[PDB]
Amino acid sequence: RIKPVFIDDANFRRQVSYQHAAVHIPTDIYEGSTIVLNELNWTSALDDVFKKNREEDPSLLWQVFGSATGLARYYPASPWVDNSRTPNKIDLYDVR
Amino acid sequence: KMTEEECRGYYYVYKDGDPTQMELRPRQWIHNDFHFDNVLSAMMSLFT
Amino acid sequence: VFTFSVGQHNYDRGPIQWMACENKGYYYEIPSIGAIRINTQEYLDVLG
Amino acid sequence: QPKPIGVGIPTINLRKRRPNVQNPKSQEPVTLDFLDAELENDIKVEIR
Amino acid sequence: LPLFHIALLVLFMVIIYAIIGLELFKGKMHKTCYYIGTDIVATVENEK
């Protein structure tokens, strides 16, 4: 994992990190299945195009690649609104 | 989930079979208490 | 034709699979409330 | 407005909801027709 | 046929014990732990 810096932003009512893209994996999809770890491998080369799109037009909101394996890689990184069970409530968000 | 590589992570259980009342549980590869792996455990199970 | 066979039963599914992948469709099995969200959304792989 | 589009009359049964079950919320889009945002002549139907 | 007196004794002993239980526990098992303001019985995973 990565521990990001999370500056606070406008045009986002939250804290964003313009260094790397965040990943969302549905609650009941294991992160480590060879199918999921492969998406997290070849998607790692999206972050530079995310960055250059953003610095070409500083008024972009979320950019997201939502893939057929449940993952969703969005930019700029920002912690998801519902953690799995760190709060009491579950998140049921499936990008598909 | 039918193999030990699959049975990892969390999953939902539904209280009262209600699709809108769910709980997160970690899924784990359990081994029945009374089994038939060796001849001692087989004799135990056949005893019970 | 997309055919969904639902539940834990002891009926035949040969005809249903035939209907499915004779008419360019697909065949899904839904045994519990947990598989609903994943099987009732995966026909957009066929339609694509 | 930033709220979801409502349908029908809301009815709830408080006496069938455990306090710690995490009901799901919603997924719908805010699809508000043009004739349902203003008052409806038959000239606005024409413009539409 | 020789087991007629054993049966005549078991039937009468069951008849006596039923009346005793009917006099001592008549209507005691009718309260339980619901959820506050709900009609949902509050139990734990493997408890009846």
Calpha distance A37→A58 (Å, rounded) = 31
Chains in contact with C via at least 3 Cβ–Cβ pairs below 8 Å:
A, B
Tokens 């056949």 sit at which residue? B46
Structure resolution in Å?
3.4
Instruction: Give the whole-angstrom CA distance, residue A36 versus residue A70.
Output: 9
Q: Closest approach of chain B CAs to the CA of A61, in angstroms?
A: 31
- The alpha helices in B1-48, defined as continuous H runs, are 39-47
Q: How big is the CA angle at A69 (ends A65 and A75), to the nearest 5 degrees?
A: 25
> What's the length of chain A?
96
Q: Which amino acid is at C16?
A: I
What one-character DSSP code corresponds to residue A89?
Answer: S
Residue type, A93: Y
Q: Which two tokens stand for residue D37?
A: 């945002």
Q: How far is CA A17 from CA A9, A14, A46, A70, in A?
A: 9, 10, 16, 23
E runs forming strands in A1-47: 7-8, 15-16, 22-24
C34 in contact with A, Cβ within 8 Å: yes
Name the token pair of B23: 């709980």
CA-to-CA dists, residue C10 to A21, C6, C13, C29, angstroms: 48, 11, 9, 13
Would you give the end-to-end CA distance of chain C in angstroms?
Answer: 15
Which of A32, A33, A84 minimises the CB distance to B10?
A: A84
Q: Which of A60, A96, A74, A68 is nearest to A24 (CA)?
A: A74
Please name which of A96, A43, A30 lies closest in space to residue A74, comparing C-alpha atoms: A43
Q: Solving technique for this entry?
A: cryo-EM
In Å, how far are B31, B35, B37 from B40, measured between CA atoms? Answer: 16, 10, 8
Give CA–CA dist A65/A62, Å, rounded. Answer: 10
Peptide bond into B19 cis (omega under 30): no
Question: In this complex, is the C-beta atom of B20 within 8 Å of any C-beta atom belonging to chain D?
Answer: yes
Alpha carbons within 13 A on the beta-carbon side of B40 = 0
CB neighbours of residue A72 within 10 Å:
20
A with D: how many residue pairs have Cβ under 8 Å apart? 5
Would you say C26 and C16 are in contact if contact means Cβ atoms under 8 Å apart?
no
> Which residue has tokens 């087991």?
E3
The Cα–Cα gap between E31 and D17 comes to: 20
Residue in D34, A29, E1, A56 with CA at minimum distance from that of residue B12: A29
**C2-6 and C26-30 strand pairing:** parallel
**Which of B8, B22, B24 lies nearest to residue A30, judging by beta carbons?**
B8
Tokens of C32: 């519990």
**A70 membership: H or E segment, kind and range:** none
- Reduce the DSSP state of residue A10 to 3 states and report it: coil
Identity of residue B11: Y
